[PDB]
């Protein structure tokens, strides 16, 4: 379960994050955790959670995995 | 009168008198010696 | 069903018997105490575990003990 | 939960006053508990509770909803911690009567007999709701304040 | 035969039993062995049923106890008048009510607490009071501090008379049991003499003292220049100068030409526009009518002559097919059980206090009261709390009757029996309706929170989205506003401004305006209905299952107050009716806190404020914000606690200190509420060992508090904490922004 | 004994409860299911249309309301099926309750489809 | 003394009917039936709530659990000085007599009783829970 | 065993008055297992001030 959890973190960062854009300017770009598909949303929520730089609504990660992965060599 | 002084010897009455004495002693000290922080 | 045990410190005061709201305990002939009476628990299948018996016992420590075991419909006191 | 709440209030407020620049604010206000309640809890929860409002919403609305969500789970755990079993068992016995006497619904009948939660189970469920609401409330406040003001 | 029945010298006045703690109880007179004893000594001190079985001795005890209470209250009133005379700014306030803050408490200059003596105006420094005594004194026509001092001495004398009456009617001449059981005579004397002669003599005081002095005070003449009241009684020509009716004397009264008394017995309605209070002429006519009504009501029951009704005959006469024997047996219950009487009187006395709160906010009876926003908030909140507590008490003593006094072999197929006999149906229906109310009332708030959070405000329950208008309340409001035209022809205005109409302002502040009702008011009223129904559920379940339940068939033998019946049968914690009072106390706190929050926010938002249009204190945010929980959290609690949290370094700093202290006490209660005495007893065992090691173990054995005392301490500190928190919040807020 | 009441022991109430399809004692469980479904799906089609999230978009309010009503009828039929799977191990049997749940599915979908036309 | 039998045709006390009566446990599992012989007509308190007039002679009530029958037995025994006995009835019609199963009430000693569930030791002489680990179930050390 | 009125000391470890001092009331001379009747000036958690003990559970100290 621990290794499946870590593989899921890696997969959702690789597919839905902005990791290849984060590493160029890591001071001014917010790390993206995973995309939001919530059909209960309205259009102001879809507009407001589309922060940048994303296509749709995303969550901004606080778990710190981009700094750890960028330090240990992920690019 | 013996029973009245026995009642005055009970625990809440003596606690009231003694805390009135202690609080009044502290109040008079903080009046005549205003705001002591040191010494 | 709960576990009710009687220990040899019983002095046959009958207090536990007259405290049970379910008629589980009874007094048997015995020779271990001056009262020649000892408690016994032949009907522990109807015991709910309220512990009134333990409250009624005068001895230190208790001579009747209720160990809450597996629950049934009778031990849960269910009328349904 | 109390002790880790103290160490994280302390950590978070000393680092917020470091990150803003005015460590003098922490040095002046941390020596008395009204300074805590005014300058860390009241002050740093302005943009949190403005996550949604009758004028609109922004990206902090999820942390405002989670903040209220944690207050609610905390409060619901107080019910299991304060009120105890026999009240609820008498209430469930009246509910059992009410279901078995109502026509056209008593054709449906339970397989497991409904009873109240046990005493140990009550303590575990109350402590569980208590702790989950504690964690969600402080995580919502911490993430929303630190991300909204920086 | 109704007559005076008294036993001579029952109990010797002696200091002997003062020196023997717990003399009243055979268990407690043995002395203290463990610490539990002390708590028992204070818990059962006034439980006279556990002292004696003899109803006569109990009745005497409660009679003298009541006298003690009255003497204490008279000491309290004496204190308020004395502090109003000696340590206040009442005269200065009389000269300028709109710009001087009522203050009647001053602190001594030690340890810096002198800062609490703030600038209240009138060349005075003290604590601004919100009890409303100044407006009551101005309405009564008091003008000088001397009259207040004289009232203080009078009330002290009356306190001494009440304590003498207590000692006398317990130790020297103590009434017999059949004196107390004359309930028909008691109702006659209290309805005639107390309410009737009370309101008659008060209407006398009003018509002869209040009306002229307050008419001159509204005219503008300096208070010192106004004639003293005895000159108003003595020279009737002055009374004819203000109201010419007084020239004719009492000749129109006896000749039934009462229409000529329309100068001072009016039916104006509304408020005095220069003063913001009800017309004292309306209040005088009101008290005269009330007087005549109650004196008529006090001649209903038969005493020593043939005329008059009989209570048992009226009770036994109302019997139907659905109820069987009907009200038979209730007379015997209510003339032999003090707890049943106490339950009825507490329920109606609490309800009456809540009605007092609503009618006094809506129809301000005192001059310069409506614009003293702090006084209005304080009075409403206070009397609402008192009300709630007395209702919970009613449920408590109802249950105490049910366990100790209920005896079905004089009470067999009766109203009470049928209630006990279909209690499962009653509680199950109340259960369902409580869940229904909870789901739909609270669910609208959660629904709104979700829709507002999801960026879909058009899907909310609000005045602009899905509307839920209070059509019935609006219709009743409109009808009562249109009432003076058709269904009340002799009324000049409506009974209250809140129905609709214009606006009465005094000194730039809004006294009262029409209160509008929308979706938010609909939602809070159904929240109120929900919480009240749940409280009723707990208390009523407590009283109906006090004797037996399917869980505990012999609960009556365990008493009214007992912790449980053991961990068996799944667990029986809090099965006693006392524990139902304990939970009802928490739920009563919940309900009334939401009620006073409703009142506070609504008044500050849609009613109060200054007149330039009207600028309200919070700009009118209620209608759009009071539909989400986040709205209450931010716009009410968070926004309005600014004043309390920044009150340091000023005269309101004590409200900040009591804010923190109340939060502390509330949290402190959770230790008692969430834990149990086994842990604490074992901890005390370790500590006792430590004391034994140093030869300091007490002879009275340290014991952990009982289960029920743990619950009692818990709920008491919980209530004290929460209520005092809202107290400090309210007072600091309304005094600073008022 | 049981408390005698003119609500629990009224004659016209007893005849009305005997006439409802949960009590007729001799009709098929499929027929009971389709009648109960034609009642309940037809009444459940309403509030999804009038109060649902697509209630103000024209030409699609009734479609989404009936589609959500049909989804709820399918969830209710699954609930009936698992209740019968857990309860019995003519109406009160495993085969009879499975026929009753299938009849409720058919009758509820037919009631929603008839409410879309109406 | 011999074991008595249940007479189903025993007149019940005068009672209007409560909501705290029997449930489906009486039809599916069991219900318990109490019987006593009264000396006069007198009102007693029903343990399920309400008052009831007993008849002069035999009486018959049926309850849902054993504690209701003990509560009525204790009430009729301490207040009215009567000698009741309550049975156990199954939906097959099986009748199980108990209380007093000896015939003499259990609050006084009678010869012929065999002591059950009696440990012949103190409570401090129980073994530790390490000695009864890894049995077929949970065991308190007082079980042995 | 010990005589009436003499002070003894309790060695039953699961007793409330273990390692404490009481006063002998009577010693039963039959074959009873716990004949020594000792009163104590302080009560236990059950409010009782009297217990029966064996011979090897009391020491006249
Ligand atoms: C428990 C922690 C604590 C401590 C260490 C103190 C200590 C002090 N407080 Mg504080 N205070 C506390 C809690 C505490 N307080 C609490 C809980 C409250 C709210 C109730 C306050 C509210 C408060 C106020 C309003 C004031 C103080 C003041 C003081 C100073 C008083 C000195 C004195 O009394 O004269 C000397 C005392 C004596 C001489 C009496 C002792 C008699 C013996 C015989 C002397 C023996 C000496 C050898 C002292 C530094 C005063 C101050 O000005 O602080 C700077 C003051 O005005 N306290
Ligand atoms: C002044 C002379 C006097 C004397 C010597 C006595 C003596 C006695 N009275 Mg009597 N009695 C008196 C005056 C007196 N009484 C008065 C003024 C009243 C009216 C209240 C009564 C009404 C009365 C009743 C109804 C009863 C007695 C009883 C007794 C007997 C025992 C009571 C006792 O010992 O507890 C002494 C009690 C106290 C010392 C505490 C006083 C509590 C005061 C009144 C309450 C107010 C305090 C106040 C709220 C402050 C609180 C502040 C804050 C901390 C909250 C004892 C012979 C009892 C009896 O005979 O039982 C068999 C009894 O039932 N008395
Ligand atoms: C009933 C309610 C009530 C309350 C809450 C207050 C409250 C107050 N009064 Mg007011 N007062 C009252 C009624 C009240 N008063 C009445 C009825 C009178 C007319 C007698 C007065 C006349 C009065 C004056 C003249 C003054 C006050 C003052 C005060 C303030 C300080 C009190 C103080 O520190 O005393 C001093 C503290 C003590 C004396 C503590 C001793 C307590 C003893 C030791 C207890 C012993 C226990 C014993 C068994 C029970 C008492 C028996 C009794 C017969 C002595 C305080 C706000 C003062 C003030 O406002 O300053 C600006 C002030 O000067 N009051
Ligand atoms: C018409 C005459 C009359 C009046 C005015 C009252 C008034 C009162 N009675 Mg009632 N009482 C009466 C006749 C009357 N009673 C009769 C005939 C009986 C026997 C059937 C009773 C039996 C009775 C009992 C058992 C009790 C009362 C109590 C009360 C008080 C209720 C507390 C309150 O809210 O009052 C508001 C308070 C006031 C208005 C304060 C002013 C009171 C003064 C003394 C004026 C009242 C007149 C008084 C009766 C005259 C006494 C003269 C005396 C020197 C002989 C109230 C003072 C209760 C009480 O509290 O006892 C102490 C109580 O327990 N009464
Ligand atoms: C209930 C309270 C009350 C009281 C105490 C009064 C009192 C009074 N009213 Mg008022 N009044 C009232 C209610 C009251 N009123 C109400 C409700 C209305 C509205 C309908 C009025 C409308 C009204 C009007 C229009 C007038 C009054 C007037 C008066 C005064 C004279 C009345 C008179 O002649 O009575 C008859 C006389 C008596 C009853 C005498 C009392 C008995 C004496 C004291 C007995 C003494 C006997 C003793 C042995 C002798 C002393 C011996 C000793 C020295 C040793 C008197 C002060 C008149 C007035 O003067 O206005 C300013 C007046 O014009 N009243
Ligand atoms: C008309 C008013 C009234 C009267 C005369 C009574 C009378 C009684 N009540 Mg009832 N009751 C009432 C209203 C009343 N109650 C209300 C308003 C409630 C709701 C709280 C109740 C709920 C209630 C319960 C649950 C119980 C009673 C019981 C009793 C009986 C014994 C009380 C006793 O001896 O306690 C002694 C008095 C005390 C221990 C006083 C301390 C109470 C708290 C701790 C003080 C509150 C804090 C204070 C306001 C401020 C603190 C300030 C500062 C120190 C921090 C006595 C018949 C008891 C009983 O057994 O009846 C047979 C009982 O169990 N009452
Ligand atoms: C905020 C915390 C909280 C909450 C939510 C509750 C809730 C409740 N209390 Mg409790 N209570 C509380 C605090 C709380 N209490 C505390 C602190 C105490 C100790 C004093 C008590 C002591 C107490 C007593 C003595 C009693 C209650 C009762 C109740 C129930 C009232 C019936 C009702 O309205 O159902 C409606 C349900 C709600 C209002 C809960 C929220 C429902 C949400 C908004 C909608 C549900 C849909 C949901 C979102 C779907 C989830 C799907 C997901 C799982 C996938 C209700 C469940 C009473 C009872 O059960 O009798 C009827 C009762 O007698 N409580
Ligand atoms: C409990 C209070 C409550 C109420 C009244 C509503 C109401 C609504 N919600 Mg909201 N909702 C709630 C709580 C509530 N919600 C909570 C607590 C949450 C967060 C968990 C939400 C989250 C939410 C979302 C995400 C959405 C809604 C939506 C809606 C709307 C349509 C829902 C729908 O179609 O259901 C179908 C309706 C039924 C199945 C009705 C069943 C009830 C019937 C009428 C009972 C009949 C009893 C009858 C009188 C008995 C007669 C007996 C006789 C025949 C014998 C409707 C206005 C939708 C919307 O767009 O809002 C506008 C939507 O998208 N809600
Ligand atoms: C409607 C109630 C009618 C009540 C009514 O008309 O009672 C009248 C009915 C007739 O009583 P009798 O004519 O036999 O009365 C004779 C004497 O006992 C009374 O004088 O009494 C009952 O049968 C009680 C049954 C209550 C049945 C439960 C009603 C519960 C209603 C709860 C909902 C209330 C909601 C609104 C609250 C504000
Ligand atoms: C804290 C706590 C205790 C411990 C609290 C106790 C024992 C009360 C202690 C009160 C005071 C501090 C002890 C008595 C003080 C005496 C007056 C001694 C004189 C002291 C002088 C300074 C006056 C319980 O006993 C308990 C029981 C049941 C549920 C919850 C709890 C619970 O939470
Ligand atoms: S168990 Fe306790 S109570 Fe019952 S007999 Fe033995 S000793 Fe007396
Ligand atoms: S627990 Fe309840 S049932 Fe079991 S013995 Fe003690 S009392 Fe009798
Ligand atoms: S002791 Fe406390 S917990 Fe154990 S049963 Fe009695 S009440 Fe419930």
mmCIF file of N, CA and C and ligand atoms in Angstrom, chain C residues 4 19-22 24-25 46-54 64 66, ligand 12:
data_model
loop_
_atom_site.group_PDB
_atom_site.id
_atom_site.type_symbol
_atom_site.label_atom_id
_atom_site.label_comp_id
_atom_site.label_asym_id
_atom_site.label_seq_id
_atom_site.Cartn_x
_atom_site.Cartn_y
_atom_site.Cartn_z
ATOM 1 N N UNK C 4 -19.877 -15.344 35.669
ATOM 2 C CA UNK C 4 -20.085 -15.002 37.070
ATOM 3 C C UNK C 4 -19.436 -16.079 37.923
ATOM 4 N N UNK C 19 -30.082 -8.763 45.330
ATOM 5 C CA UNK C 19 -29.778 -7.602 44.516
ATOM 6 C C UNK C 19 -29.899 -7.860 43.029
ATOM 7 N N UNK C 20 -29.837 -9.113 42.600
ATOM 8 C CA UNK C 20 -29.905 -9.408 41.178
ATOM 9 C C UNK C 20 -31.307 -9.179 40.628
ATOM 10 N N UNK C 21 -31.453 -8.397 39.558
ATOM 11 C CA UNK C 21 -32.783 -8.125 39.007
ATOM 12 C C UNK C 21 -33.232 -9.190 38.019
ATOM 13 N N UNK C 22 -32.568 -10.348 38.013
ATOM 14 C CA UNK C 22 -32.789 -11.357 36.987
ATOM 15 C C UNK C 22 -32.839 -12.784 37.495
ATOM 16 N N UNK C 24 -30.375 -15.021 39.016
ATOM 17 C CA UNK C 24 -29.294 -15.825 38.477
ATOM 18 C C UNK C 24 -28.595 -16.594 39.591
ATOM 19 N N UNK C 25 -28.467 -15.980 40.765
ATOM 20 C CA UNK C 25 -27.751 -16.527 41.900
ATOM 21 C C UNK C 25 -28.718 -17.186 42.872
ATOM 22 N N UNK C 46 -28.946 -16.021 31.790
ATOM 23 C CA UNK C 46 -29.875 -14.905 31.863
ATOM 24 C C UNK C 46 -29.238 -13.657 32.448
ATOM 25 N N UNK C 47 -27.962 -13.727 32.811
ATOM 26 C CA UNK C 47 -27.251 -12.605 33.408
ATOM 27 C C UNK C 47 -26.972 -11.511 32.383
ATOM 28 N N UNK C 48 -27.291 -10.267 32.740
ATOM 29 C CA UNK C 48 -27.056 -9.129 31.856
ATOM 30 C C UNK C 48 -25.745 -8.432 32.187
ATOM 31 N N UNK C 49 -25.236 -8.577 33.408
ATOM 32 C CA UNK C 49 -23.978 -7.963 33.767
ATOM 33 C C UNK C 49 -24.121 -6.591 34.379
ATOM 34 N N UNK C 50 -25.249 -6.336 35.046
ATOM 35 C CA UNK C 50 -25.538 -5.043 35.656
ATOM 36 C C UNK C 50 -24.633 -4.767 36.851
ATOM 37 N N UNK C 51 -24.132 -5.827 37.496
ATOM 38 C CA UNK C 51 -23.221 -5.785 38.648
ATOM 39 C C UNK C 51 -23.861 -5.229 39.918
ATOM 40 N N UNK C 52 -25.162 -5.445 40.119
ATOM 41 C CA UNK C 52 -25.772 -5.097 41.399
ATOM 42 C C UNK C 52 -25.270 -6.020 42.499
ATOM 43 N N UNK C 53 -25.002 -7.279 42.140
ATOM 44 C CA UNK C 53 -24.471 -8.269 43.071
ATOM 45 C C UNK C 53 -23.131 -7.816 43.638
ATOM 46 N N UNK C 54 -22.248 -7.308 42.771
ATOM 47 C CA UNK C 54 -20.946 -6.817 43.216
ATOM 48 C C UNK C 54 -21.092 -5.603 44.123
ATOM 49 N N UNK C 64 -18.169 -12.057 44.591
ATOM 50 C CA UNK C 64 -18.873 -12.288 43.337
ATOM 51 C C UNK C 64 -18.295 -11.352 42.277
ATOM 52 N N UNK C 66 -18.324 -10.365 37.943
ATOM 53 C CA UNK C 66 -19.004 -10.456 36.658
ATOM 54 C C UNK C 66 -18.027 -10.017 35.578
HETATM 55 S S1 LIG I 12 -24.780 -8.850 37.137
HETATM 56 FE FE1 LIG I 12 -26.839 -8.296 37.138
HETATM 57 S S2 LIG I 12 -27.407 -10.321 36.792
HETATM 58 FE FE2 LIG I 12 -25.345 -10.871 36.744
HETATM 59 S S3 LIG I 12 -25.394 -11.203 38.851
HETATM 60 FE FE3 LIG I 12 -24.857 -9.181 39.241
HETATM 61 S S4 LIG I 12 -26.917 -8.632 39.242
HETATM 62 FE FE4 LIG I 12 -27.463 -10.669 38.896
#
